[PDB]
């Protein structure tokens, strides 16, 4: 009955495709065609953060929009002060192969992980003046590619073992496991309402998950290569993907299909990081061609370019008030742009 | 700047000094990426050279070495192989006694892996130290099992020397653009303690080339 089950799966896939095709009467291009586009984005390097002596692989802004944590492959986790450009903390890591870092919304913790398949939680605010690891979350059989704090006690991590997990930092055991991806999961994005998250994988598919129940809700398949970055629209009913075929795409949770494509002919390098402006008007993407691009989400125009990095732009984040954009890069430098 | 601001700046300066010291200390260490098949033999290489990835530390002639075993990463290597792009050398281990073994052929699988690693875009100029392990099993099996099982176009004497030379030549033939990177091939057995000196010599040559390029003179 294996052939019968495969035929049933194909029929269900075709049914889903035609059901989501029926509700695609218009396109995002036509609706936003008559609106005024972004004139010209021209940001400048307000600050340059120096002190990392290897490639930057991840950065995350703090909730206060002044502190930010940086992960670099020199084994250092640096918390910066983007205003005065001075280092608040410098955390040495047990394993220097770190691919992700996160900042707790409360600011009391940071997380990091990588080729060790472990998420480490560091207590920033102790009675002593040092930063110490509080718990190590083991249980992933592949490298950790992303991690995002739910609160002070819950964190969700993606891994290269085709699995996302939800952890309880109090006990150190993954309460929930989110299976279904056939490729390595590369990115995570928690919703503003925090009740669900999306995850892009190497199987060129993005999946929306329910944090409470622990099952996949929707699956989005429009890309041609591995999805490297995923980000949530500030509304919470959309998300953007950055893949290896030099194409960004926008998906709508309610419409359950791709909305609009962000690509150009002269860009043949994959996207390493994506992020959104505060209002969702500007989609910012870091690329392999040493510079970060600024796209207008509603019209898919290249509003601006954040050139200024001498190597691949690996990480990219916007503040919670939308005041600044920070870009890390493989040339070991972080840059704040306004 | 207030008093607290000045003290924060002073703390940041101390952090910067510590980071500079750490970077200076880390620049003095030689990093090696250990690759090869599971049964090719790397545990013996690791032993003779003394989940996640495994880091091995050893010192030889005032030179500090870091060896990274990535054989436990059961993921898609194209996503994390650039983490080792800046590396002194690659130690590739191949068991030349499994030419007649069946996992397709094990020797051909090792050849495919060597071809993929050598011609990777992240290791264009990274010298490869190739270890052909399990010498005496190969010698003992070359008398009965001929090399024709693995290579159908060998047409050579069924002796250890000719077969081993043919295998080494076939492996170094995969080195496309052999003008920037050099492959150091060594024949090692289980009971043979000379590989540390070979790795040190290859690393010293790589370091000479590296600081020749540093001096703007190459």
């Amino acid at each position, epitope marked *: 009955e294996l052939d019968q089950l495969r035929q049933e799966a194909e029929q269900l896939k075709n049914q889903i495709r035609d059901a989501r095709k029926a509700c695609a009467d218009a396109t995002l291009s036509q609706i936003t065609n008559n609106i005024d586009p972004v004139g010209r984005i021209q940001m400048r390097t307000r600050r340059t953060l120096r002190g990392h002596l290897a490639k930057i692989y991840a950065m995350h802004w703090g909730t206060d929009s002044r*502190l930010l944590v940086s992960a670099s492959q020199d084994g250092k986790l640096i918390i910066w002060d983007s205003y005065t450009t001075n280092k*608040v903390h410098a955390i040495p890591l047990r394993s220097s192969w770190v691919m992700t870092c996160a900042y707790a919304p409360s*600011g009391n913790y940071v997380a990091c992980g990588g080729l060790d398949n472990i998420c480490s939680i560091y207590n920033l605010k102790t*009675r002593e*003046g*040092n930063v110490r690891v509080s718990r190590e979350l083991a249980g992933h059989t592949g490298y950790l590619s992303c991690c995002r704090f739910l609160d002070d006690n819950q964190i969700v991590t993606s891994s290269g073992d085709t699995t996302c997990a939800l952890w309880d930092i109090e006990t150190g055991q993954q309460t929930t496991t989110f299976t279904g991806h056939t490729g390595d999961v590369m990115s995570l994005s928690l919703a503003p309402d925090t009740r669900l998250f999306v995850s892009g994988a190497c199987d060129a598919s993005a999946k929306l998950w329910d944090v409470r129940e622990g099952m996949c809700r929707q699956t989005f398949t429009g890309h041609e290569s591995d999805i490297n970055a995923i980000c949530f629209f500030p509304n919470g009913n959309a998300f953007a993907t950055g893949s290896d075929d030099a194409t960004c795409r926008l998906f709508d949770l309610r419409a359950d299909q791709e909305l609009m494509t962000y690509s150009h002919d002269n860009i043949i390098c994959g996207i390493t990081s994506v992020s959104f402006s505060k209002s969702g008007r500007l989609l910012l993407a870091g690329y392999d061609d040493f510079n970060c691009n600024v796209w207008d989400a509603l019209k898919a125009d290249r509003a601006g370019v954040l050139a200024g990095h001498d190597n691949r732009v690996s990480c990219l984040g916007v503040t919670d008030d939308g005041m600044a954009v920070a870009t890390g890069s493989w040339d070991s430098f972080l840059k704040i742009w306004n | 700047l*207030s*008093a607290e601001d000045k003290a*924060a700046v*002073e703390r940041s300066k101390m952090i910067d000094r510590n980071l500079r010291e750490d970077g200076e200390k880390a620049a003095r260490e030689v990093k090696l990426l250990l690759l090869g098949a599971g049964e090719s033999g790397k545990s013996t290489i690791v032993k003779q050279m003394k989940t996640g990835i495994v880091e091995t530390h050893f010192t030889f002639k005032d030179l500090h070495f870091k060896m990274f075993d990535v054989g436990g990463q059961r993921s898609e290597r194209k996503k994390w192989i650039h983490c080792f792009e800046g590396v002194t050398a690659i130690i590739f281990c191949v068991a030349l006694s499994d030419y007649d073994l069946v996992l397709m052929n094990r020797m051909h699988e090792s050849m495919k892996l060597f071809d993929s690693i050598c011609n990777n875009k992240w290791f264009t100029d990274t010298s490869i130290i190739l270890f052909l392990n399990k010498k005496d099993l190969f010698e003992e099996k070359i008398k009965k099992s001929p090399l024709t099982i693995c290579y159908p176009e060998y047409a050579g004497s069924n002796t250890y020397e000719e077969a081993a030379a043919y295998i080494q030549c076939q492996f170094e033939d995969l080195n496309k653009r052999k003008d920037t990177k050099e492959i150091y091939t060594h024949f090692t057995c289980a009971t043979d303690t000379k590989n540390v000196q070979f790795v040190f010599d290859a690393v010293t040559d790589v370091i000479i080339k590296n600081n020749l390029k540093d001096c703007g003179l190459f």
Partner: single-chain antibody
Amino acid sequence: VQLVESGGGLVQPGGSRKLSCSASGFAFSSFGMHWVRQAPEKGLEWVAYISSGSGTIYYADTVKGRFTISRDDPKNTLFLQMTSLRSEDTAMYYCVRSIYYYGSSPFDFWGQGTTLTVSSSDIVMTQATSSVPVTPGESVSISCRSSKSLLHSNGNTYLYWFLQRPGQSPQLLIYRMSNLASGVPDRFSGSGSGTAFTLTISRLEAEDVGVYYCMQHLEYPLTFGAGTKLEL
């Protein structure tokens, strides 16, 4: 976290003595440490400061050129060398740790305190109220004044509040006005603007009875304010 001070005792005038403080339970090397003295009947008074790494040292004008402060990070000890002691140098000396980064809380932990007795442009902080009679369970307010505006261009008002229970070392309540210190109940509140500041307690128990001090950290020599005693 504990700080224990050693030394003190009877000293003839014109003599010398060395004060030592032993630090345990925290990263002593990453903290800047202060010396603050309190006269037998008067309030607290700042003495000297040595930064992290000993790269910055400050002294009170009363002791400048006469006292010397040094630290031994591997030994986790803070030293105060004082020579030619005057009759006005008799006081109980406190050791205070204070770490400075963004969002930090300086002066958070104070030592037990050692006492020494000798036989026979600075910002001014004012606390007019004193010996306030207080009924438990009520709401009280303590006022403060400054000769200069403590509000810097950073937007930070460097006004610190401390509680000194009878027979106990002073403890931090609010570091930069309207910033409740860790381990302090939510009843205490800080408010103020410019040169006038207020400390408010919504409801109180017999625990928070004692002398309340106000300190400025805008510029050295880190002047204190006169005590505001609360009596049950």
